[PDB]
């Protein structure tokens, strides 16, 4: 079973000479970590020679990093490594990436560093070559993984979940798909409910996604598709619950960025019959609500895809009517983004504004009347002015694009809902991630709140793989990130932001800002005031805070409204009852007339999310953004690493595993009494007087609480200054004695000298000596 279609899926040298402690990794500035062969020592400073650059430099011995040998290179599973450290992880992958593999594993973590070009890895042939294959045989592929989740759903009999994450333009969204696309090729009988589900993308991706400075296809909603099954076979059904679409986009497009794909694909002229159904001139160009930034996405065809959208939309079992009834609503925004004014009245060209009427089925004139400055209930009316009016128009634009998106999805769930016997499900999540920008307020907070919650489920499953060597290495040990829930809580707990933006909401900005600081502020480790870390192109905030990714400075400006939408009641009421089904439905009076602030639903939506995740045997996938250039094959060290910093490698509160073989060359100095004997330390341990719940001696390794292994370094430090200065004092004494004899002799000699002399100076003052000398002729 090898090498037919394995060209970019899964020998060479064994040997070119590697040495042992002579070779290692060194911090480069361009390549992150560059390879080197050492030359000499001098304390902290270490002289080492760069391998294939060939020129030497100074280096602290604590930046130097261990490196693995050859037959251990371009490794399938990094868990099976000697040096799973920074400069090693960043290597292996690079080696594999640059070599046509994108997928790799590290413990129970998936690694696909995004290849910006298309790839043959997806052929049914391959798919076939996969299902039923145990993990350790076939080279690394999302397939292998996607498979074993069912391999596992059946036999173990429970739901599994598959969380696919990484940064933006990483590949989350692009695999989530490839995934349902796989599961698909295992069911058929003897355009297909299978082929119907596959289409649910082009729909939601059309309306939902958008081109971002980063990635031309960035999502804007949290997705979590569930895929159930029958007691036996292929699927029984599936469903979709989305999370927090960007409402903002609809009206504003950050420069060099655009609005949702559909909008632009609506003016491409694929089916001109509709130009007239749309009352729209097919030029993307000078419409407003959708062109603040690029209007063209290169290597992305608006007609072809749109057609594909229409085409798909049908297989969804959407009537010709339902089909149209969407485009329609969608076009109406293009137009309202137009309704001029001049005043509290001036509706310049009530000629376009004329137009929204035919589309919703509400006389436009009735509508421009009833809410240019028209009224509300208690009903009364009061002068709507030239600006909110403008800022009340988008109130309507967005306040719908959401009700519409909502509907669309809610409707897809309807045709994907066969009610056959359902037993288990493979839930796939394709959600956001943590983001820190030069400005982060509210929208940009929940992405974070939702993730924090996602970290609990993360290490929830680590404490667990952790007790997987409390079994492996015979030891029973008896918070470790107990402030994390002190963040979770800080935010979601009852006397918190949420419990308030919801509660304290005579509401203006500081009425709201005051409670916050006064209550769990001033005094919390996490919830603290701001300062300047110099965010660069960076700007304005009011509060700071810590997340398992670091901190991020927030603002609170106009949120009590930000958590809501000002659909001017009667505009609504008027829209409420109109003739266009979708429209009329999208604005129905309640169960009955005579609720929502964005979180009541999200906290609700989210809570629900979690609940189910814990009802599943998760599987983690990790998406790495090779580089900033959208170019395949390129590697941007400084970025890759940034990413590895918070997912599967160091920077949370657990025991510091350590092999004896190391504990020796390490702290052996804190207890100098021994003679091998792997027990060379049990002694150092006691030979220190340590309170030991604080540690556990497993077999080939040792586990300490936090700051334990920390103090050892702090002691080992202060311990060797002494031990050196001691041996220095020794040398010093050996000197003062190497010469004492010498000294004492002289002490004599001098006594001779300043004695005879002190007399040869009396002899010449003795009356008689003079006289004698007076005469020796």
């Amino acid at each position: 079973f090898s090498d037919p279609d394995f060209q970019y899926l899964a020998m060479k040298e064994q040997t070119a000479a590697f040495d042992g402690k002579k070779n290692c990794w060194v911090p480069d500035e361009k390549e992150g970590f560059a390879s080197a062969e050492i030359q000499s020592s001098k304390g902290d400073e270490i002289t080492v020679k760069i391998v294939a650059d060939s020129s030497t430099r100074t280096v602290k011995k604590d930046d130097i990093q261990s490196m693995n040998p050859p037959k251990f290179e371009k490794l399938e599973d990094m868990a099976n490594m000697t040096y799973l450290n920074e400069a090693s992880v960043l290597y292996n992958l690079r080696s594999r990436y640059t070599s046509g593999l994108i997928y790799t594993y590290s413990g129970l973590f998936c690694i696909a560093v995004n290849p910006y070009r298309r790839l043959p890895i997806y052929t049914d042939s391959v798919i076939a070559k996969y299902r039923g294959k145990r993990k350790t045989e076939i080279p690394p592929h999302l397939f292998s993984v996607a498979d074993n989740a069912y391999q596992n759903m059946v036999t173990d009999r429970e739901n599994q979940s598959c969380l696919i994450t990484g940064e933006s333009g990483a590949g989350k969204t692009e695999n989530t798909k490839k995934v349902i696309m796989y599961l698909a090729k295992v069911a058929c009988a003897v355009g297909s409910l299978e082929d119907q589900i596959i289409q649910a993308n082009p729909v939601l991706e059309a309306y939902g996604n958008a081109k971002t400075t980063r990635n031309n296809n960035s999502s804007r909603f949290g997705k979590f598709i569930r895929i159930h099954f029958g007691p036996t076979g292929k699927i029984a059904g599936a469903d979709i619950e989305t999370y927090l679409l960007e409402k903002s986009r609809v009206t504003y497009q950050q420069s060099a960025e655009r609005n949702y794909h559909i909008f632009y694909q609506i003016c491409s002229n694929a089916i001109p019959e509709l130009n007239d159904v749309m009352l729209v001139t097919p030029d993307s160009g000078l419409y407003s609500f959708i062109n603040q930034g690029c209007l063209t996405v290169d290597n992305i065809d608006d007609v072809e895809e749109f057609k594909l959208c229409d085409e798909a939309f049908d297989i969804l079992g959407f009537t010709k009517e339902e089909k149209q009834s969407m485009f329609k609503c969608t076009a109406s925004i293009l137009h309202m983004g137009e309704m001029k004014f001049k005043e509290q009245a001036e509706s310049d060209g009530t000629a376009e504004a004329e137009k929204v009427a035919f589309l919703c089925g509400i006389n436009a004139g009735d509508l421009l009347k009833a809410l240019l400055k028209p009224k509300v209930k208690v009903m009364v009316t009061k002068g709507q002015n030239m600006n909110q009016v403008v800022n009340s128009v988008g109130a309507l634009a967005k306040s719908l694009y959401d009700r519409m998106f909502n509907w669309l999805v809610r409707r897809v769930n309807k045709t994907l809902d066969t009610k056959a016997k359902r037993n288990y499900y493979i839930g796939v999540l394709d959600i956001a991630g943590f983001e820190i920008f030069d400005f982060n307020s509210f929208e940009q907070l929940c992405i974070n709140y939702t993730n924090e919650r996602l970290q609990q489920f993360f290490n929830h499953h680590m404490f667990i793989l952790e007790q997987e060597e409390y079994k492996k290495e015979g030891i029973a040990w008896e918070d470790f990130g107990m402030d994390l829930q002190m963040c979770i809580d800080l935010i979601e707990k009852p006397m918190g932001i949420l419990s308030i933006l919801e509660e304290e909401c005579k509401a203006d900005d500081k009425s709201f800002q005051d409670k916050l600081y006064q209550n769990h502020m001033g005094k919390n480790r996490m919830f603290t005031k701001p300062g300047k870390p110099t965010r660069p192109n960076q700007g304005p905030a009011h509060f700071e805070l810590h997340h398992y990714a670091g901190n991020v400075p927030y603002s609170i400006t106009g949120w009590l409204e930000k958590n809501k939408d000002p659909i001017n009641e009667n505009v609504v009421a008027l829209l409420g009852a109109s003739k266009e089904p979708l429209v009329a439905e999208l604005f129905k009076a309640p169960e009955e007339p005579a609720f929502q602030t964005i979180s009541a639903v999200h906290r609700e939506s989210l809570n629900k999310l979690m609940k189910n995740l814990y009802s599943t045997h998760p599987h983690f996938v990790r998406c790495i953004i090779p580089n900033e250039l959208k170019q395949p094959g390129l590697v941007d060290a400084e970025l890759v690493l940034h990413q590895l910093q918070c997912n599967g490698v160091l920077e949370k509160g657990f025991p510091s595993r350590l092999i004896y073989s190391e504990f020796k060359q390490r702290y052996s100095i804190l207890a100098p009494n021994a003679i091998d004997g792997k027990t060379v330390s049990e002694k150092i341990l006691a030979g220190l007087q340590m309170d030991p719940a604080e540690y556990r001696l497993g077999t080939t390794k040792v586990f300490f609480k936090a700051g334990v292994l920390g103090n050892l370094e702090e002691m080992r430090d202060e311990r060797l200054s002494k031990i050196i200065s001691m041996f220095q004092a020794h040398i010093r004494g050996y000197l003062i004695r190497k010469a004492y004899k010498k000294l004492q002799d002289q002490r004599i000699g001098l006594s001779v000298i300043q004695r005879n002399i002190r007399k040869w100076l009396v002899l010449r003052n003795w009356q008689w000596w003079k006289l004698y000398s007076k005469v020796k002729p």
Binding site: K21, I38, S40, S41, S668, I669, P672, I723, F727, H730
Partner: protein, 153 residues
Amino acid sequence: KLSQDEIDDLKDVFELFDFWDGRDGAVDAFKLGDVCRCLGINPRNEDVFAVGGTHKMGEKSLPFEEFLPAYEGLMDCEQGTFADYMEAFKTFDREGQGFISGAELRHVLTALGERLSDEDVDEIIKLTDLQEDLEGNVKYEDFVKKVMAGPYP
């Protein structure tokens, strides 16, 4: 505490110092620690600075009865054992072979701990008759036995 014949092992060597300061019945705190070395000891300068002791020459001088509580205090002082002097020179042996080049060795004690004047280091080597190979490395293991195993063996 020390014995009477010991209170003598102190009268005898201080009558050499009261000498080289001038027979007056006093000596200079600066020279203190030095005397304490002649008496088979190796206190640390930080130490001698506790027991009275003085930085630069001529600052404060002392007679026997004060120069006494010195020795004794500086007597109950921590000294080093062979291990210490090896379980600490190991953190500089990368080959683990048991060598430390001279260029380094110098730095070790000339740059770390209670730094040593290049001078001392030059003599202390002359005396201990040290030497390096063609690789320029030295077998420190020994060196620590010579210096530990005193002047005249």
